[PDB]
Symmetry: C5
Subunit: 24 residues, 5 copies
Amino acid sequence: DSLKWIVFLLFLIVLLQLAIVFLL
Amino acid sequence: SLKWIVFLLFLIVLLQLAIVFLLRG
Amino acid sequence: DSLKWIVFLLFLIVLLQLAIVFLLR
Amino acid sequence: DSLKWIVFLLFLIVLLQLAIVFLLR
Amino acid sequence: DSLKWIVFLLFLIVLLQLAIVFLLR
């Protein structure tokens, strides 16, 4: 459903923010 | 409304990937 | 309606991500 | 409820994005 | 419930934005 995709996309955004902190 | 939220989150993910790519180089 | 506010805020976030990408480029 | 807390967190995210843009500029 | 996970992930995103701002300044 849509809520599961929202949760997964937020998890991906968290991972991408982690990658941004490492590169900074 | 949920479809719009999913689409906007997907766009945000794409933009975050672009930001990561720009930060790499 | 909270869903409309959520969608509008996500759209604003998309625009701000575009601004950040432009600044990084 | 959860929706209002989500709206508040998204508003905080927008504020932090604006701060990031200001720091980059 | 998925709403609790959404709220927690938004909180994590807020924390990571705070960390990004701290690193930028």
